[PDB]
Design an enzyme around this catalytic site. Structure first.
Site, PDB file in Angstrom:
ATOM      1  CB  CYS A 144       0.070   9.572   2.575  1.00 39.81           C
ATOM      2  SG  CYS A 144       1.374   8.406   2.076  1.00 39.81           S
ATOM      3  CG  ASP A 187       1.472 -20.786  -0.608  1.00 46.24           C
ATOM      4  OD1 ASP A 187       1.208 -21.649   0.245  1.00 46.24           O
ATOM      5  OD2 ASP A 187       2.233 -19.819  -0.384  1.00 46.24           O
ATOM      6  CG  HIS A 245       2.747   4.378   1.903  1.00 44.76           C
ATOM      7  ND1 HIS A 245       2.053   5.354   1.189  1.00 44.76           N
ATOM      8  CD2 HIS A 245       3.833   4.038   1.163  1.00 44.76           C
ATOM      9  CE1 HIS A 245       2.731   5.581   0.064  1.00 44.76           C
ATOM     10  NE2 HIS A 245       3.801   4.804   0.026  1.00 44.76           N
ATOM     11  CB  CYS A 281      -2.620   5.181   2.374  1.00 40.82           C
ATOM     12  SG  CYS A 281      -1.046   5.624   3.161  1.00 40.82           S
ATOM     13  CB  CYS A 328      -0.222   7.931  -1.284  1.00 35.94           C
ATOM     14  SG  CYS A 328      -0.770   6.459  -0.354  1.00 35.94           S
ATOM     15  CG  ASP A 335       1.704 -13.931  -4.526  1.00 36.89           C
ATOM     16  OD1 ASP A 335       1.588 -14.625  -5.554  1.00 36.89           O
ATOM     17  OD2 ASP A 335       2.629 -14.093  -3.706  1.00 36.89           O
TER      18      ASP A 335
HETATM   19 ZN   LIG Z   1      -2.505  13.820  -1.290  1.00 34.79          ZN
END
Ligand SMILES: [Zn+2]
Ligand SMILES: [Zn+2]
Lengths: 373, 373
Positions: free
Chosen positions: B313, B92, B339, B310, B308, B270
């Site tokens: 998770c 920025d 996450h 990730c 999810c 963003d």
């Molecule tokens: Zn899952």
């Protein structure tokens, strides 16, 4: 793997190297155990802790019993599952931190009652309850519950506390043994007391050996006595313990303390990295500690340490870490902690290899010459 | 790869999906850019940021110019090397945070002088100095320096600020072009202003298109106006921008804001994850946000979100993360941040795939029905 088997592969003077085999894994000795407080090694995922070389971590019973709670952790499947570390965990008894952190403590032959430093709720520890809590957490190595001996201590008070601790060691032994699941799957360590007094250290060793434990801690040190005195007490205290079991020096310590303690027969170590008064910027190097907050590092492109094989030293500069710590950024704590624990594991590896190769005394001399240059 | 090439692979209504190719990498659009403040995405190693799916991150010029300093970063080899992120970085201009964070600001046609919020040292930004700082950082996508239009703004004041911003856009263009290394290797985006006024938005778009930029941001939103009004302004504002260049909605935003903005022709996003008043415990899920600090999660063994992919998770429970955040543990911030940024990237992936398959309108409806159930 068995419940517990300590094997000594090689020796040099009083120093030993070998392995402890347990159901959840093998521990290479001499070992450094990173400390998990409230179910986390500060700023590190468990996989990162493992990546540094750790075979086992320590969990603080006092913190865990306050938050999130021992019964809750048991309901959730135990500490290993809760925090995502599947290798051995040693839990302390909780007694030390009751004395150092809690308030309104009431001590007796039965145990201690105290107020939480978090919310003033009332709690209790005893040999029986400490062992039970460590069971609920699913600890692999359980520490007997003892009474804290402050430093300095008069001979009478040191003797009284040691004697109480030995009575409590027997109570801990019996509590552990009466719980089938715990007796068959975990190990129990006893703690030698007696302050700086040789006769009391001997009585304590004898009492512990008569009861019989899987390992023996030297308690009551790393509480302000200074290195010379600590080494002096270790000189006579460690040989009193059974040779064929691990020797654990609780709360120690700085790299040079570890080296000297191994020279005196210690197999296991733990300690918490300093944070107060800017000490969170302290990074270990083979040329001694540095404080990364110092302005002289602001444009230093070298890694924290020139030889360290850790991921932090592979990827980031002193200048970057200096900036992060000065800015109070979480990544600063992450990187500093990973490097420092990796440094400790590399120290332990060098210790193990040097003992195995019969050149540990030389290693200790070379280490000190450079570390204190 | 070229300096800059934006290709649109597929469209549905006003929505587009495609790629921006740059020297340091390819950016899939619509894109979410995690925000790096002082040269770090909070609590994440760059490799973790990449693992979540991010192709590009944002760097805050205002923070960087204060600490560690733009000239210092240049001396050390640039921002990419400094922080260990080798893919594109958008910086920025620094102007917004001068207004929101600094003190004693003095504004003029030349630029702004201000006092650091860190130590009250005196600093300056102008179109020329902002572009220079972004060069010193080694930015891949450089933002033109504009003047902040507060919300709400009167028509006269919105017009005056927009007109100044357009003069500054030309100055930014010329500064960028006069620096050979920057012109040949980086890209420059212009920022549309005009508050909520259609005629001013049109004049701004026309001025920017006449100057010519590699991309066009819609500035002046996400400053308190509310979603309905933001969407209303986007409805008329985005079509005014050149169709064949990326459209960047600065500072947006919540998942539902992103979906609606893509429906209105936005390609890049963003925003910074909330932390105030316990919001640091906010976790995104496909069934809407939850606050993990809530007592109802204390014994919940499910992952943060049921679908999810990730690592958080995969490995830890709501109960564990609840404990960490309540305890103020650094690992809590690490896991929550990983996450949440992974969730945003999965949202962007679902958006991209649905546009590519001509079913984005259906996706948006399905998303909203579940997210707000
Ligand atoms: Zn899952
Ligand atoms: Zn090296």
């Amino acid at each position: 793997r068995p419940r517990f088997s300590f094997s000594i592969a090689a020796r040099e003077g009083k120093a030993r190297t070998g392995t402890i085999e347990m159901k959840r894994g093998v521990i290479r000795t001499p070992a450094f155990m990173p400390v998990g407080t409230a179910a986390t090694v500060k700023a590190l995922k468990p996989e990162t802790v493992r990546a540094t070389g750790a075979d086992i971590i320590l969990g603080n019973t006092y913190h865990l019993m306050l938050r999130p709670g021992a019964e809750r952790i048991a309901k959730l499947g135990g500490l290993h599952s809760f925090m995502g570390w599947d290798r051995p965990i040693l839990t302390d008894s909780g007694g030390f931190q009751v004395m150092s952190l809690s308030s309104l403590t009431k001590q007796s032959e039965e145990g201690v009652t105290f107020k939480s430093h978090l919310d003033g709720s009332r709690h209790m520890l005893s040999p029986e309850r400490s062992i039970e809590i460590q069971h609920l957490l699913g600890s692999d190595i359980v520490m007997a519950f003892d009474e804290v001996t402050p430093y300095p201590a008069t001979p009478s008070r040191a003797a009284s506390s040691m004697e109480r601790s030995m009575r409590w060691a027997k109570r801990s032994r019996d509590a552990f043994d009466s719980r089938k699941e715990q007796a068959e799957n975990a190990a129990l360590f006893g703690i030698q007391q007696g302050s700086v007094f040789e006769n009391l250290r001997q009585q304590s060793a004898d009492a512990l050996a008569e009861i019989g434990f899987d390992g023996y801690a030297v308690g009551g040190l790393a509480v302000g006595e200074g290195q010379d005195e600590m080494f002096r007490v270790l000189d006579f205290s460690v040989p009193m313990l059974p040779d064929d079991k691990p020797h654990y020096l609780m709360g120690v310590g700085k790299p040079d303390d570890i080296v000297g303690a191994v020279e005196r027969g210690i197999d296991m170590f733990d300690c918490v990295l300093p944070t107060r008064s800017g000490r969170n910027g302290q990074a270990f190097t083979w040329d001694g500690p540095i404080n990364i907050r110092n302005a002289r590092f602001s444009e230093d492109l070298k890694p924290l340490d020139s030889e360290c094989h850790c991921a932090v030293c592979q990827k980031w500069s002193r200048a970057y870490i200096h900036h992060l710590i000065r800015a109070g950024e979480i990544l600063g704590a992450m990187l500093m902690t990973e490097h420092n624990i990796a440094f400790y594991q590399q120290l332990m590896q060098k210790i193990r290899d040097s003992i195995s190769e019969g050149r540990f005394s030389q290693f200790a001399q070379d280490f000190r010459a450079r570390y204190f240059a």
